[PDB]
Amino acid sequence: KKLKLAPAKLALLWKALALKLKKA
């Protein structure tokens, strides 16, 4: 078991994120 999952390096598309950060 060795997770190479780095979501912050790939999935930071800001979509949904920046929306909910504005509570949209």
Question: In the chain, what are the helix, strand and coil shares in percent, each to the nearest 5?
Answer: 30, 0, 70
Measured over the CA atoms of residue 10, residue 8, residue 12 and residue 24, the dihedral's sign is positive
CA dist 18 → 7, 9, 13 (Å): 16, 16, 9
What is the Cα–Cα distance from 8 to 17, expressed in whole angstroms?
12
Q: Identify how the structure was determined.
A: NMR
Left, alpha or beta for 23 (phi > 0: left; psi -120 to 50: alpha)?
Answer: left
Secondary structure (DSSP) of 1-24:
------GGGTS---TTHHHHTTT-
| Neighbour-count burial for 10-22, b at 16+ CB within 10 Å, e otherwise | eeeeeeeeeeeee
Q: Provide the 8-state DSSP code for 19.
A: H
